[model samples]
Target chain A: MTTSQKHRDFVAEPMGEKPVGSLAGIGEVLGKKLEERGFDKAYVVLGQFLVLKKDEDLFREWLKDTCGANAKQSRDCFGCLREWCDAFL
Target chain B: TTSQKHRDFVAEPMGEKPVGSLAGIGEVLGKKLEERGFDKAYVVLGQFLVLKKDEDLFREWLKDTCGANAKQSRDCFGCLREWCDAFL
Candidate 1:
């Protein structure tokens, strides 16, 4: 249930077609908001991460603005994508 | 049938393909894309995924951004879609 565990589980895979909720710290509510904005899948979010070139501040701020993720939540997702890219990108 | 560019584009991981290397993005449009910050195929892929692979949105945006024609935009979108299918 922790972000770290979620990040560990997620970062280990090539996550295409997985929903936004699969990303760390993105609970159902936040995931729905992201989906509504066209980020329905994990790879879609990864696109933004690469577009931002893995900039933590920009990504977290973008997450916050899009889905109302709190500070810790935003960073959790950021960390997940950061590590995922490191391993796969 | 697709162009050789499309085959080549979808054939492998687009680690750092220049925008001009993408299907339908020849020299002129590629230069325009690069000038506007989309120097690499992955950059445009980012936009494609961000649009959730919507054909209309991607085509329209591509047209607007680089003045691509209908066939050109569709060709570019199709290549990225195929690449994502295998790689993303």
Candidate 2:
């Protein structure tokens, strides 16, 4: 599916127990890294985002540090998480 | 002047209460937090859960956001954490 497709699906509901890869912008490569680092599920990363108090910079930095996500990828992931928070958190 | 507001808040589930209901979050701090997008206590609780209930980080963020003093921050953190223990 395309990024927009993924984004739409993700924001539509509570992401309970969905894999980390289910998040938009977290394709196989980033998903693998995230899983390896104990972020196997989207909620784990959501937990981290909440832990950061939804601070964009902190969450972005963590995504980069954990998965080597570049600026654009980090921004996309942040947006996805932020949207999810708006809906669910 | 001691208050049981914190205890009362923690004693019950925080079902959709506004952020102001939190202990140490008087009108001024609650307004500041709401302006910063934390309109609900659950949103702030989301932050607490995300932080894994770390006292220092929570207190630091609370202080940085609304200029809460040490005692106030601690009280807020304790209240939220206890609520989580009970409900979450």
Candidate 3:
């Protein structure tokens, strides 16, 4: 799915207990890496984002370092979190 | 202008106040925040909770987002942390 679609879908409701794979830009490979690193769920990743204090650059860098995501992928993921924080926090 | 009012406001359950209630989130910041999707204080609070109330990290985020200075970020973070202590 497109990033916008994923963003809309994510912010439309409470994340509850969804998996990390539910996040935008977090495809199967990245999701598996995140899961392996103990961020098995969307909220858990959210926790890390918050722990990083929601700095887009820091979060993006961490995402890239953690999963080997490129710049666009990291930005897409960060934007998703930023938008979600705005909508649902 | 981190006053006691800002402190007191954030030192409790946000309970659905508009995003403007945060310490550094005056009209301009609030509008910017809302435009970026933070229309409610709880949403920001949610981010705070998710972060586990880390001071340095939270302050950096505030600065990056709205150009809040160190004092402003500290006040905001303190308020939110105090609020969590009382509520969540």
Candidate 4:
């Protein structure tokens, strides 16, 4: 799915036990990397987001460093989580 | 005790508070949570959000993890839920 679609879908509801792969721009490869590092669930990633106090740069950088997400990928995921927090967090 | 803890917890951002700072999580429970790597209140909040704030699931998890009774688990859940409403 497109990033916009993914973003809209994700932010529209609570993350619950959704896999990290459910996140926008987190494709299979990146999602596997995240899972390997114990962020198996989308909510776990959201945990990191909140732990960073929702700072954009920090979260984006962490995503990039952790899972090799590119600029667009990391940005897409960050925006998705940010908006999710706005709606349901 | 419960009311004060609930009030203080929800009254402000958690901001690195120890797990013990959570309502109903006293020294014993907090130490148990800490042993399992949930040293911070936010870590437990992560679990709460992961469970989608479901009362039954969260409460059960707390009981299973730290031996919290029904009332203690409920207090912690309510505190986190209200804190989320206020600041998440």
Candidate 5:
């Protein structure tokens, strides 16, 4: 139930070309689902995060809607993106 | 004819540039974007990012939102895409 290394790793980089699976909580299963939906790259999904103005509830809702991500998955992904933006965006 | 604006935008961070600072988004299109409360280039970038940078979708949205021509939208898309490559 703790945060994964993948999540920590994702928050630590520029994420220029990392795959969607690179995002925290988005394993191959969820990653494939997002990729099929056009969130193939971490940057692409980051865009959605930024576009939504980093609104936690809205983003969590979007994650659930897009790939049926459960609450923990949504929170982890959101946190990863939020950190990247804070440091890079 | 068009690469200059695109080049300049991709050249550096778009700190506070108005929406028109985006390539293909000149005065007229700028006004439309501003009218919709998108006064900054980042606002449109938000749109581009949210749409997952889908060329077709973003271009269509540009045209529909501001009447940008094919070339205009394409130019704008290139700028933002390249910008993301270097910055995002």
Candidate 6:
């Protein structure tokens, strides 16, 4: 799928403390699941991405394991964060 | 003295280095950070990125969290900033 406008926006600047749901493909369902696991903020999720060394496969796998994110969902989220890193990290 | 520390830290990817490896984070501040579970340099970097790398916010946070003095906080922030420029 093509990248969403939300993904572009997320990559445009520093994420600051945006809500976890603000991350592309992380809708209310996955967002709530992540929040329950202490990832209520987008930056916290970004932390995990960075701590994982920005490894795409590892991140996608972890996202799936963490919140039951499917392949497409995890891919979108990873791409979002990866671009954010390129822009600002 | 601290500049050497900053130089070493800023030149690398940080790759799971302990919080003590951060410039200006001496033994005492490292201990404080460890107690608060920021044992890894990447964890602190996570907070820095979260704050959008705002110098004031990061400096204030470093001080508030570990009782870092002005110069200490500035050193730490500069170290992280340079690391980002090089590797982030």
DockQ of each: 0.50, 0.18, 0.11, 0.20, 0.44, 0.22
Sort all candidates by DockQ, best to worst. 1, 5, 6, 4, 2, 3
Tens digits of per-residue lDDT for model 4, B4-73: 8789989886767899999999999999988887888987897887566788999999999999998889
> RMSDs, each prediction?
2.5, 6.2, 8.4, 6.7, 3.1, 6.6
CAPRI quality of model 1: medium
Winner on DockQ between 5 and 6 is 5
Tens-digit per-residue lDDT, A1-89, candidate 2: 34577888988877766898988889999999998987887866877776576789999999999999989888878888888767654
Tens digit of lDDT per residue, candidate 5, span B1-88?
5578789999886765788998889899999978876788877887898687889999999989889999989999999989989987
Indicate whether candidate 2 or candidate 4 has the larger TM-score.
4
Quote the lDDT for B10 in model 5.
Answer: 93
Q: Model 2, B13-42: lDDT tens per residue?
A: 665689888889889899999888888887
Best by TM-score: 1
lDDT of 3 by residue, A1-79 (tens): 4566877787677676678888888889999998887677787677667656577888888888888878887877777
Lowest-sum lDDT 10-residue window in model 6 chain B: B79-88
- lDDT string for model 5 (A1-89, tens) is 36688877887767877899999878888998999998888888887775676789999999999999999999999998887777666
- Per-residue error for B29 in candidate 6, Å, reads 13
Candidate 2 C-alpha error for residue B26, in Å: 13
Superposed Cα deviation of residue B38, candidate 6 (Å) = 12
Q: After superposition, which runs of candidate 6 have C-alpha atoms over 4 Å from their true positions?
A: B1-21, B25-44, B47-88
What TM-score does chain A reach in every model?
0.93, 0.93, 0.90, 0.94, 0.93, 0.95
